[PDB]
Amino acid sequence: ATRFASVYAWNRKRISNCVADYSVLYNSASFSTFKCYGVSPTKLNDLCFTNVYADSFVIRGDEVRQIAPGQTGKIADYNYKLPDDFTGCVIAWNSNNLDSKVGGNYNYLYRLFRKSNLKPFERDISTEIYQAGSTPCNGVEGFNCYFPLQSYGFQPTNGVGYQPYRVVVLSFELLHAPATVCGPKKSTNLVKNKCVNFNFNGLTGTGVLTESNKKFLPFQQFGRDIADTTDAVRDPQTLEILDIT
Amino acid sequence: GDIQLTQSPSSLSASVGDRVTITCRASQSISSYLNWYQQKPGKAPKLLIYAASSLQSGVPSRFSGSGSGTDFTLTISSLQPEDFATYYCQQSYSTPRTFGQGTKVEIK
Amino acid sequence: GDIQLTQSPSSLSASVGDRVTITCRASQSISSYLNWYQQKPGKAPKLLIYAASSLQSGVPSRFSGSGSGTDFTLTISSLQPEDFATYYCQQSYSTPRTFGQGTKVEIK
Amino acid sequence: QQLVESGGGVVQPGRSLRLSCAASGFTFSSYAMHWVRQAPGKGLEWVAVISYDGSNKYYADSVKGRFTISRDNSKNTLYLQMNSLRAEDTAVYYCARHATLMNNKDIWGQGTLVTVSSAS
Amino acid sequence: QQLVESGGGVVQPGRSLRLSCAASGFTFSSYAMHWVRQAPGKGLEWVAVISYDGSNKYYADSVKGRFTISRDNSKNTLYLQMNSLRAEDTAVYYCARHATLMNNKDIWGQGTLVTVSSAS
Amino acid sequence: QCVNLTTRTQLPPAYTNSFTRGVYYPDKVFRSSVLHSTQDLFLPFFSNVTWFHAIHVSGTNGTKRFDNPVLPFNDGVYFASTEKSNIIRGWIFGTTLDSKTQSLLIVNNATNVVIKVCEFQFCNDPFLGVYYHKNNKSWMESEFRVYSSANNCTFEYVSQPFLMDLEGKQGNFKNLREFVFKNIDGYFKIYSKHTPINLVRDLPQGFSALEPLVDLPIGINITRFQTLLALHRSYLTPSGWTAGAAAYYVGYLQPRTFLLKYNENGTITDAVDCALD
Ligand SMILES: *[C@@H]1O[C@H](CO)[C@@H](O)[C@H](O)[C@H]1NC(C)=O
């Protein structure tokens, strides 16, 4: 994506009803800090999800260690809060060649103060004045009270610790809802007239697969015989009517 | 080729009660295989963090590690008068292993 | 009542390479909430120092602020031929805000 | 990034003249905004605030003429109607912002002349 | 628990000097072991591994001098012979162990000086 | 929006008798000329089906009667309509017909039906408004005459239009269109059919087999619903609303054991309920 917002108004995208391309995530390998939870990153290729929350923002190259489920520091204190029990992956890389511009980048912002720690996954766009001391400023700025937000200072004159990271966070769950977003798997070349173990679409058995002229209705999957055996199946990748003997 | 390390800064003269972030950057994406050491000059390198995110016996949470991939972080917090020494990061990803050039935290 | 400002001197005709200290004094004890502006007469007031002790983008350290409480200081150093204009201090402590009467640094 | 102002002109005293000032580059919405006055040869005198992040309006009691201030936030614009005029207010006005130790957002309009006189 | 080292000394270049390092408290046998180098004012530079649990020997190609490494497992001791010397290797060596995300066994010897020079 | 015209009308729901009706294929498995028996939710034969009218002219002059109630889902739902000129688009299926629950919003906006499972705010008299854009000379559909808010949305999908015309037939088809809706085990599945009918209104003796259209992850139980409508605007005549006439058929499903007779091509003709008599 071409434009991530800051952490005071981070973008959140509910994603479901599609398939996961988890391969090139690991094959990317241009990513600085790439960690995961729940169960191992190699294991998560197939172990799939009801409803994922993909929310992303841009933070500094020093504060990214604050982004960890159950830590402190400003981004996890007042800006964006990972929960106490978390599943997803933190994906983090540098975008110094895009974000930090000569003449100064000050598009980006963050919240520096709030009268409590931040509830998990809840943004804070309320840019009203907080009153640290007791003297009421009441919307306008003044004494004992500061402005809530502040920018970052990004230029390519910054050191490597001050480079902008485009942290995207993937968060996962599991419910009475089905695994609506789920990773695909590779196929096996069809064998005709060979005793061959098989799986089609999760249907499993062992038989001799042949070409067959029995004619399905389109929505259908299996055929069956009188005996409630699985007699004939249709190849999902190339539609064809395959007997099972 | 070899795996290059990048330890930054290579020194930082510090004061009492600080929170110093000694960064060890990597040329490749290393999973978590990075460590940290205490060395007063002439001592044995006392291990501080293993797998870049886990504390060690005898060493309280005034030291605190995090990071993965290329980016690794030494999170020294509430800087103590005994913590001023020469420190080191460490890969164990491939062979050869290299260590960082060291970061001497010292009294201002 | 209101908070009175005291900008002194209200003008100072100066020369090349000077180090002019334009003082803005306050009737109350204001923490650091004072600013500084560039105005050639007819321009927009270009902010110079914010919170009385911090520089600004585009403006090098030839200008330099300090002070707190009642006493605030505009530390102009190595006075440049473009720096000769009408300047201003600024409270933001309470409501109402008042500004200083201005100090015109001008070529001798 | 940029501030534009409604047109100034010569108005008879006692009248009213709404002041429009539209923003550009970044919104009015997340910030406050101010008005200040510069009479010719006189210092910059603060006039009134606006505070959109709640809602509150403060006026200078030095020039307490019920110069009313409110918004058009969706156009990033701000309206202060010149009420209860008197000739010494004949000056140029600016749309303003104060760096309150946190931001650096002090952005100033181009300046337009309000004139309070019976002679055009 | 504890590691002891063979004696360091001043050796002329091109020569060889076997390095002995014996363990105590827990055996060498179940683990690997390493050697590292510290020149004065220089960082800790890894030298070579030993891997008893199969048998394999890896050397740094940065200092690739066929510094040979093998065991005396029954004495919990390890031998690396300093071969093909050159003066910049004049340093202190350490017997080492790396916590590879599983163990916490990083135990370090006392450190002895190898010196490579024709002047004693 | 939420423009509303309740126009409540009296009289008893006109009932009817589904003779052989509402037999879908409850599997993908292809079977040929066999008698298969399952006990599943169906509309049992010889059942009481309410012939409702969304818009009903009873002639004096005009007098268009907008009656379509919010209706409970109960166990399962059957649906049938003719509507040579479409006035029907989708259904509002939901839990509170409001926020606080998800919402099943089927809009067959021409031509890309955009099924929607979201959280909406459905008005008191929801239906799809249609007007004339004057830009590109196209009849748009104002979709917020149904519902005010659209947000929080859980699911979205698009497919080829379920509602389809043929026409040119000056009747004699009526294009009888049936849709079965069964929400369970996380899969709310849709069924369809298109049939010619020469009879004036009610249903023939023929069998209608309904294939599953899409099997979708829903996860929200539906205890009530109402249909949707397409109306428009008119201009000065002695505003315009209630395009044409509208009537449809509704009946509730029920667990029953059917014996299913597939054909040599797997086209089920004869189905028989076991508990019928
Ligand atoms: C479905 O029923 C469950 C209770 O079994 C209820 O919690 C849920 O809200 C209903 N549908 C939804 C998800 O709105």
Side-chain angles (χ1 to χ4, degrees), chain A residues 136-166:
Chain A
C137 297
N138 197 356
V140 74
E141 72 272 17
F143 177 61
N144 296 119
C145 65
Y146 294 170
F147 193 81
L149 303 178
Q150 187 185 1
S151 177
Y152 287 158
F154 285 120
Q155 295 86 13
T157 65
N158 294 325
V160 69
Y162 295 164
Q163 291 178 352
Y165 288 164
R166 286 194 174 187

PDB file of all heavy atoms in Angstrom, chain A residues 136-166:
ATOM      1  N   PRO A 136      -8.146  24.690  34.645  1.00  0.00           N
ATOM      2  CA  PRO A 136      -8.904  24.280  33.457  1.00  0.00           C
ATOM      3  C   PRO A 136      -8.604  25.168  32.255  1.00  0.00           C
ATOM      4  O   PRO A 136      -8.837  26.377  32.278  1.00  0.00           O
ATOM      5  CB  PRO A 136     -10.363  24.402  33.909  1.00  0.00           C
ATOM      6  CG  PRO A 136     -10.336  25.420  34.993  1.00  0.00           C
ATOM      7  CD  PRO A 136      -9.012  25.274  35.684  1.00  0.00           C
ATOM      8  N   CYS A 137      -8.073  24.548  31.205  1.00  0.00           N
ATOM      9  CA  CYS A 137      -7.826  25.240  29.949  1.00  0.00           C
ATOM     10  C   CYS A 137      -9.043  25.233  29.034  1.00  0.00           C
ATOM     11  O   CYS A 137      -9.250  26.209  28.301  1.00  0.00           O
ATOM     12  CB  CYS A 137      -6.634  24.602  29.235  1.00  0.00           C
ATOM     13  SG  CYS A 137      -5.078  24.720  30.144  1.00  0.00           S
ATOM     14  N   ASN A 138      -9.831  24.156  29.079  1.00  0.00           N
ATOM     15  CA  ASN A 138     -11.154  24.044  28.460  1.00  0.00           C
ATOM     16  C   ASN A 138     -11.098  24.260  26.949  1.00  0.00           C
ATOM     17  O   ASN A 138     -11.631  25.228  26.408  1.00  0.00           O
ATOM     18  CB  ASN A 138     -12.148  24.996  29.125  1.00  0.00           C
ATOM     19  CG  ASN A 138     -13.600  24.643  28.828  1.00  0.00           C
ATOM     20  OD1 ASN A 138     -13.892  23.723  28.065  1.00  0.00           O
ATOM     21  ND2 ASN A 138     -14.519  25.360  29.462  1.00  0.00           N
ATOM     22  N   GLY A 139     -10.415  23.343  26.269  1.00  0.00           N
ATOM     23  CA  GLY A 139     -10.405  23.283  24.827  1.00  0.00           C
ATOM     24  C   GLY A 139      -9.292  24.068  24.169  1.00  0.00           C
ATOM     25  O   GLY A 139      -8.659  23.558  23.239  1.00  0.00           O
ATOM     26  N   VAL A 140      -9.051  25.292  24.608  1.00  0.00           N
ATOM     27  CA  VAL A 140      -7.932  26.079  24.117  1.00  0.00           C
ATOM     28  C   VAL A 140      -6.717  25.665  24.934  1.00  0.00           C
ATOM     29  O   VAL A 140      -6.843  25.089  26.020  1.00  0.00           O
ATOM     30  CB  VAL A 140      -8.232  27.594  24.220  1.00  0.00           C
ATOM     31  CG1 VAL A 140      -8.152  28.076  25.659  1.00  0.00           C
ATOM     32  CG2 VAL A 140      -7.363  28.421  23.281  1.00  0.00           C
ATOM     33  N   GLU A 141      -5.532  25.912  24.388  1.00  0.00           N
ATOM     34  CA  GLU A 141      -4.296  25.588  25.083  1.00  0.00           C
ATOM     35  C   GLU A 141      -4.063  26.561  26.228  1.00  0.00           C
ATOM     36  O   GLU A 141      -4.762  27.570  26.350  1.00  0.00           O
ATOM     37  CB  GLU A 141      -3.132  25.646  24.104  1.00  0.00           C
ATOM     38  CG  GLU A 141      -2.776  27.065  23.682  1.00  0.00           C
ATOM     39  CD  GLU A 141      -3.554  27.571  22.481  1.00  0.00           C
ATOM     40  OE1 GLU A 141      -4.601  26.987  22.141  1.00  0.00           O
ATOM     41  OE2 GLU A 141      -3.106  28.561  21.867  1.00  0.00           O
ATOM     42  N   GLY A 142      -3.071  26.268  27.062  1.00  0.00           N
ATOM     43  CA  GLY A 142      -2.740  27.178  28.139  1.00  0.00           C
ATOM     44  C   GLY A 142      -1.668  26.670  29.079  1.00  0.00           C
ATOM     45  O   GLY A 142      -0.733  25.988  28.649  1.00  0.00           O
ATOM     46  N   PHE A 143      -1.790  26.999  30.364  1.00  0.00           N
ATOM     47  CA  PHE A 143      -0.832  26.576  31.372  1.00  0.00           C
ATOM     48  C   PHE A 143      -1.367  25.378  32.143  1.00  0.00           C
ATOM     49  O   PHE A 143      -2.579  25.239  32.340  1.00  0.00           O
ATOM     50  CB  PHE A 143      -0.474  27.720  32.325  1.00  0.00           C
ATOM     51  CG  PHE A 143       0.455  27.314  33.429  1.00  0.00           C
ATOM     52  CD1 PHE A 143       1.725  26.834  33.146  1.00  0.00           C
ATOM     53  CD2 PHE A 143       0.074  27.446  34.750  1.00  0.00           C
ATOM     54  CE1 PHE A 143       2.582  26.460  34.154  1.00  0.00           C
ATOM     55  CE2 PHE A 143       0.930  27.077  35.769  1.00  0.00           C
ATOM     56  CZ  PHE A 143       2.186  26.585  35.469  1.00  0.00           C
ATOM     57  N   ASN A 144      -0.427  24.479  32.484  1.00  0.00           N
ATOM     58  CA  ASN A 144      -0.554  23.158  33.104  1.00  0.00           C
ATOM     59  C   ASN A 144      -1.105  22.141  32.119  1.00  0.00           C
ATOM     60  O   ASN A 144      -1.178  20.951  32.433  1.00  0.00           O
ATOM     61  CB  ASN A 144      -1.417  23.160  34.368  1.00  0.00           C
ATOM     62  CG  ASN A 144      -0.830  23.985  35.479  1.00  0.00           C
ATOM     63  OD1 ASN A 144      -1.441  24.946  35.934  1.00  0.00           O
ATOM     64  ND2 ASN A 144       0.359  23.613  35.929  1.00  0.00           N
ATOM     65  N   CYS A 145      -1.481  22.587  30.930  1.00  0.00           N
ATOM     66  CA  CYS A 145      -2.073  21.747  29.914  1.00  0.00           C
ATOM     67  C   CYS A 145      -1.238  21.862  28.651  1.00  0.00           C
ATOM     68  O   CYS A 145      -0.690  22.922  28.343  1.00  0.00           O
ATOM     69  CB  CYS A 145      -3.525  22.152  29.649  1.00  0.00           C
ATOM     70  SG  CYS A 145      -3.731  23.792  28.943  1.00  0.00           S
ATOM     71  N   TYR A 146      -1.112  20.755  27.931  1.00  0.00           N
ATOM     72  CA  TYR A 146      -0.362  20.745  26.689  1.00  0.00           C
ATOM     73  C   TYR A 146      -1.284  20.342  25.552  1.00  0.00           C
ATOM     74  O   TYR A 146      -2.422  19.922  25.761  1.00  0.00           O
ATOM     75  CB  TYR A 146       0.823  19.770  26.710  1.00  0.00           C
ATOM     76  CG  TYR A 146       1.959  20.069  27.663  1.00  0.00           C
ATOM     77  CD1 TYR A 146       2.951  19.123  27.881  1.00  0.00           C
ATOM     78  CD2 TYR A 146       2.060  21.283  28.319  1.00  0.00           C
ATOM     79  CE1 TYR A 146       3.999  19.371  28.738  1.00  0.00           C
ATOM     80  CE2 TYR A 146       3.101  21.537  29.184  1.00  0.00           C
ATOM     81  CZ  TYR A 146       4.068  20.579  29.385  1.00  0.00           C
ATOM     82  OH  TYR A 146       5.111  20.834  30.240  1.00  0.00           O
ATOM     83  N   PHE A 147      -0.764  20.464  24.342  1.00  0.00           N
ATOM     84  CA  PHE A 147      -1.440  19.902  23.191  1.00  0.00           C
ATOM     85  C   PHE A 147      -1.294  18.381  23.241  1.00  0.00           C
ATOM     86  O   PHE A 147      -0.296  17.870  23.753  1.00  0.00           O
ATOM     87  CB  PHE A 147      -0.822  20.465  21.917  1.00  0.00           C
ATOM     88  CG  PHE A 147      -1.617  20.205  20.686  1.00  0.00           C
ATOM     89  CD1 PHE A 147      -2.705  20.996  20.379  1.00  0.00           C
ATOM     90  CD2 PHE A 147      -1.291  19.161  19.844  1.00  0.00           C
ATOM     91  CE1 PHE A 147      -3.442  20.759  19.243  1.00  0.00           C
ATOM     92  CE2 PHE A 147      -2.023  18.918  18.708  1.00  0.00           C
ATOM     93  CZ  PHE A 147      -3.102  19.714  18.409  1.00  0.00           C
ATOM     94  N   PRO A 148      -2.284  17.626  22.757  1.00  0.00           N
ATOM     95  CA  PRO A 148      -2.153  16.162  22.822  1.00  0.00           C
ATOM     96  C   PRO A 148      -1.136  15.576  21.863  1.00  0.00           C
ATOM     97  O   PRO A 148      -0.357  14.704  22.263  1.00  0.00           O
ATOM     98  CB  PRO A 148      -3.569  15.674  22.505  1.00  0.00           C
ATOM     99  CG  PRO A 148      -4.183  16.777  21.754  1.00  0.00           C
ATOM    100  CD  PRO A 148      -3.642  18.022  22.364  1.00  0.00           C
ATOM    101  N   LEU A 149      -1.105  16.019  20.614  1.00  0.00           N
ATOM    102  CA  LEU A 149      -0.370  15.320  19.575  1.00  0.00           C
ATOM    103  C   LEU A 149       0.980  15.975  19.329  1.00  0.00           C
ATOM    104  O   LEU A 149       1.228  17.113  19.727  1.00  0.00           O
ATOM    105  CB  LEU A 149      -1.160  15.289  18.268  1.00  0.00           C
ATOM    106  CG  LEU A 149      -2.559  14.670  18.347  1.00  0.00           C
ATOM    107  CD1 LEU A 149      -3.254  14.733  16.997  1.00  0.00           C
ATOM    108  CD2 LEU A 149      -2.522  13.255  18.864  1.00  0.00           C
ATOM    109  N   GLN A 150       1.853  15.231  18.661  1.00  0.00           N
ATOM    110  CA  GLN A 150       3.150  15.743  18.249  1.00  0.00           C
ATOM    111  C   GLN A 150       3.532  15.003  16.979  1.00  0.00           C
ATOM    112  O   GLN A 150       3.055  13.898  16.725  1.00  0.00           O
ATOM    113  CB  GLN A 150       4.210  15.555  19.347  1.00  0.00           C
ATOM    114  CG  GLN A 150       5.559  16.219  19.067  1.00  0.00           C
ATOM    115  CD  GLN A 150       6.600  15.921  20.102  1.00  0.00           C
ATOM    116  OE1 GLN A 150       6.346  15.198  21.058  1.00  0.00           O
ATOM    117  NE2 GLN A 150       7.795  16.461  19.909  1.00  0.00           N
ATOM    118  N   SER A 151       4.354  15.633  16.158  1.00  0.00           N
ATOM    119  CA  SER A 151       4.865  14.966  14.976  1.00  0.00           C
ATOM    120  C   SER A 151       6.075  14.108  15.321  1.00  0.00           C
ATOM    121  O   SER A 151       6.542  14.063  16.460  1.00  0.00           O
ATOM    122  CB  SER A 151       5.224  15.983  13.902  1.00  0.00           C
ATOM    123  OG  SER A 151       5.791  15.323  12.784  1.00  0.00           O
ATOM    124  N   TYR A 152       6.570  13.398  14.318  1.00  0.00           N
ATOM    125  CA  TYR A 152       7.924  12.884  14.278  1.00  0.00           C
ATOM    126  C   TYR A 152       8.749  13.819  13.412  1.00  0.00           C
ATOM    127  O   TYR A 152       8.195  14.598  12.633  1.00  0.00           O
ATOM    128  CB  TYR A 152       7.968  11.479  13.686  1.00  0.00           C
ATOM    129  CG  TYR A 152       7.434  10.395  14.582  1.00  0.00           C
ATOM    130  CD1 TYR A 152       6.990   9.193  14.052  1.00  0.00           C
ATOM    131  CD2 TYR A 152       7.354  10.576  15.951  1.00  0.00           C
ATOM    132  CE1 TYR A 152       6.502   8.204  14.852  1.00  0.00           C
ATOM    133  CE2 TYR A 152       6.875   9.578  16.760  1.00  0.00           C
ATOM    134  CZ  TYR A 152       6.442   8.406  16.201  1.00  0.00           C
ATOM    135  OH  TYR A 152       5.958   7.417  17.000  1.00  0.00           O
ATOM    136  N   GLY A 153      10.070  13.752  13.548  1.00  0.00           N
ATOM    137  CA  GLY A 153      10.942  14.436  12.617  1.00  0.00           C
ATOM    138  C   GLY A 153      11.646  13.439  11.719  1.00  0.00           C
ATOM    139  O   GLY A 153      12.594  12.769  12.157  1.00  0.00           O
ATOM    140  N   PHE A 154      11.210  13.324  10.467  1.00  0.00           N
ATOM    141  CA  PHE A 154      11.843  12.401   9.536  1.00  0.00           C
ATOM    142  C   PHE A 154      12.512  13.160   8.404  1.00  0.00           C
ATOM    143  O   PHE A 154      11.886  14.001   7.755  1.00  0.00           O
ATOM    144  CB  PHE A 154      10.862  11.372   8.973  1.00  0.00           C
ATOM    145  CG  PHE A 154      10.495  10.294   9.947  1.00  0.00           C
ATOM    146  CD1 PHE A 154       9.186  10.107  10.341  1.00  0.00           C
ATOM    147  CD2 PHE A 154      11.457   9.413  10.404  1.00  0.00           C
ATOM    148  CE1 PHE A 154       8.858   9.094  11.203  1.00  0.00           C
ATOM    149  CE2 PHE A 154      11.130   8.410  11.287  1.00  0.00           C
ATOM    150  CZ  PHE A 154       9.827   8.253  11.684  1.00  0.00           C
ATOM    151  N   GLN A 155      13.791  12.870   8.195  1.00  0.00           N
ATOM    152  CA  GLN A 155      14.598  13.214   7.038  1.00  0.00           C
ATOM    153  C   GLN A 155      15.532  12.035   6.807  1.00  0.00           C
ATOM    154  O   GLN A 155      15.782  11.260   7.735  1.00  0.00           O
ATOM    155  CB  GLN A 155      15.431  14.490   7.251  1.00  0.00           C
ATOM    156  CG  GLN A 155      14.654  15.778   7.420  1.00  0.00           C
ATOM    157  CD  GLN A 155      14.239  16.000   8.855  1.00  0.00           C
ATOM    158  OE1 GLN A 155      14.734  15.328   9.759  1.00  0.00           O
ATOM    159  NE2 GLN A 155      13.348  16.954   9.079  1.00  0.00           N
ATOM    160  N   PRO A 156      16.074  11.878   5.593  1.00  0.00           N
ATOM    161  CA  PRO A 156      17.142  10.884   5.402  1.00  0.00           C
ATOM    162  C   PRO A 156      18.475  11.256   6.046  1.00  0.00           C
ATOM    163  O   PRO A 156      19.424  10.469   6.002  1.00  0.00           O
ATOM    164  CB  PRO A 156      17.269  10.793   3.876  1.00  0.00           C
ATOM    165  CG  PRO A 156      16.692  12.052   3.366  1.00  0.00           C
ATOM    166  CD  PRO A 156      15.584  12.404   4.309  1.00  0.00           C
ATOM    167  N   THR A 157      18.557  12.450   6.646  1.00  0.00           N
ATOM    168  CA  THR A 157      19.693  12.818   7.484  1.00  0.00           C
ATOM    169  C   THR A 157      19.654  12.132   8.845  1.00  0.00           C
ATOM    170  O   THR A 157      20.614  12.254   9.615  1.00  0.00           O
ATOM    171  CB  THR A 157      19.729  14.334   7.684  1.00  0.00           C
ATOM    172  OG1 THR A 157      18.572  14.744   8.422  1.00  0.00           O
ATOM    173  CG2 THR A 157      19.721  15.039   6.343  1.00  0.00           C
ATOM    174  N   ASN A 158      18.565  11.439   9.168  1.00  0.00           N
ATOM    175  CA  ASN A 158      18.487  10.711  10.424  1.00  0.00           C
ATOM    176  C   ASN A 158      19.421   9.512  10.403  1.00  0.00           C
ATOM    177  O   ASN A 158      19.763   8.988   9.341  1.00  0.00           O
ATOM    178  CB  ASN A 158      17.063  10.228  10.671  1.00  0.00           C
ATOM    179  CG  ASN A 158      16.092  11.360  10.878  1.00  0.00           C
ATOM    180  OD1 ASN A 158      16.430  12.392  11.455  1.00  0.00           O
ATOM    181  ND2 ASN A 158      14.859  11.155  10.447  1.00  0.00           N
ATOM    182  N   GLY A 159      19.825   9.071  11.588  1.00  0.00           N
ATOM    183  CA  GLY A 159      20.540   7.820  11.707  1.00  0.00           C
ATOM    184  C   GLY A 159      19.627   6.620  11.518  1.00  0.00           C
ATOM    185  O   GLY A 159      18.417   6.735  11.311  1.00  0.00           O
ATOM    186  N   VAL A 160      20.231   5.433  11.619  1.00  0.00           N
ATOM    187  CA  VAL A 160      19.510   4.195  11.331  1.00  0.00           C
ATOM    188  C   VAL A 160      18.505   3.888  12.437  1.00  0.00           C
ATOM    189  O   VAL A 160      17.485   3.226  12.208  1.00  0.00           O
ATOM    190  CB  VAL A 160      20.510   3.041  11.101  1.00  0.00           C
ATOM    191  CG1 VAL A 160      21.249   2.655  12.382  1.00  0.00           C
ATOM    192  CG2 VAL A 160      19.838   1.833  10.454  1.00  0.00           C
ATOM    193  N   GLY A 161      18.745   4.410  13.641  1.00  0.00           N
ATOM    194  CA  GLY A 161      17.805   4.194  14.722  1.00  0.00           C
ATOM    195  C   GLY A 161      16.582   5.081  14.625  1.00  0.00           C
ATOM    196  O   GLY A 161      15.574   4.829  15.291  1.00  0.00           O
ATOM    197  N   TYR A 162      16.648   6.126  13.802  1.00  0.00           N
ATOM    198  CA  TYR A 162      15.550   7.071  13.661  1.00  0.00           C
ATOM    199  C   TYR A 162      14.842   6.936  12.326  1.00  0.00           C
ATOM    200  O   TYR A 162      14.284   7.919  11.833  1.00  0.00           O
ATOM    201  CB  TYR A 162      16.053   8.506  13.819  1.00  0.00           C
ATOM    202  CG  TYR A 162      16.588   8.856  15.187  1.00  0.00           C
ATOM    203  CD1 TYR A 162      17.371   9.984  15.367  1.00  0.00           C
ATOM    204  CD2 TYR A 162      16.315   8.069  16.294  1.00  0.00           C
ATOM    205  CE1 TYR A 162      17.871  10.314  16.604  1.00  0.00           C
ATOM    206  CE2 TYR A 162      16.815   8.386  17.534  1.00  0.00           C
ATOM    207  CZ  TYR A 162      17.587   9.513  17.684  1.00  0.00           C
ATOM    208  OH  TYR A 162      18.080   9.835  18.927  1.00  0.00           O
ATOM    209  N   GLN A 163      14.858   5.750  11.734  1.00  0.00           N
ATOM    210  CA  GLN A 163      14.267   5.558  10.422  1.00  0.00           C
ATOM    211  C   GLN A 163      12.817   5.098  10.557  1.00  0.00           C
ATOM    212  O   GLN A 163      12.479   4.382  11.502  1.00  0.00           O
ATOM    213  CB  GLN A 163      15.088   4.541   9.634  1.00  0.00           C
ATOM    214  CG  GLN A 163      16.455   5.068   9.262  1.00  0.00           C
ATOM    215  CD  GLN A 163      17.303   4.055   8.532  1.00  0.00           C
ATOM    216  OE1 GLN A 163      16.939   2.887   8.423  1.00  0.00           O
ATOM    217  NE2 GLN A 163      18.438   4.503   8.010  1.00  0.00           N
ATOM    218  N   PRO A 164      11.935   5.497   9.642  1.00  0.00           N
ATOM    219  CA  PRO A 164      10.521   5.154   9.789  1.00  0.00           C
ATOM    220  C   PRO A 164      10.238   3.707   9.423  1.00  0.00           C
ATOM    221  O   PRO A 164      10.608   3.213   8.358  1.00  0.00           O
ATOM    222  CB  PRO A 164       9.825   6.109   8.818  1.00  0.00           C
ATOM    223  CG  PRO A 164      10.846   6.395   7.793  1.00  0.00           C
ATOM    224  CD  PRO A 164      12.164   6.390   8.494  1.00  0.00           C
ATOM    225  N   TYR A 165       9.548   3.030  10.328  1.00  0.00           N
ATOM    226  CA  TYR A 165       9.076   1.681  10.091  1.00  0.00           C
ATOM    227  C   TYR A 165       7.602   1.739   9.751  1.00  0.00           C
ATOM    228  O   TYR A 165       6.833   2.472  10.383  1.00  0.00           O
ATOM    229  CB  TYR A 165       9.291   0.780  11.303  1.00  0.00           C
ATOM    230  CG  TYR A 165      10.732   0.415  11.551  1.00  0.00           C
ATOM    231  CD1 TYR A 165      11.134  -0.107  12.770  1.00  0.00           C
ATOM    232  CD2 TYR A 165      11.691   0.592  10.569  1.00  0.00           C
ATOM    233  CE1 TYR A 165      12.447  -0.441  12.999  1.00  0.00           C
ATOM    234  CE2 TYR A 165      13.004   0.264  10.785  1.00  0.00           C
ATOM    235  CZ  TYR A 165      13.377  -0.252  12.004  1.00  0.00           C
ATOM    236  OH  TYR A 165      14.689  -0.584  12.237  1.00  0.00           O
ATOM    237  N   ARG A 166       7.225   0.988   8.724  1.00  0.00           N
ATOM    238  CA  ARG A 166       5.822   0.816   8.375  1.00  0.00           C
ATOM    239  C   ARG A 166       5.344  -0.481   9.006  1.00  0.00           C
ATOM    240  O   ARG A 166       5.268  -1.513   8.338  1.00  0.00           O
ATOM    241  CB  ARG A 166       5.604   0.795   6.865  1.00  0.00           C
ATOM    242  CG  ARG A 166       5.735   2.144   6.197  1.00  0.00           C
ATOM    243  CD  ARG A 166       5.170   2.096   4.789  1.00  0.00           C
ATOM    244  NE  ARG A 166       5.139   3.410   4.156  1.00  0.00           N
ATOM    245  CZ  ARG A 166       4.564   3.655   2.986  1.00  0.00           C
ATOM    246  NH1 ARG A 166       3.949   2.678   2.334  1.00  0.00           N
ATOM    247  NH2 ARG A 166       4.579   4.878   2.474  1.00  0.00           N
TER     248      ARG A 166
END
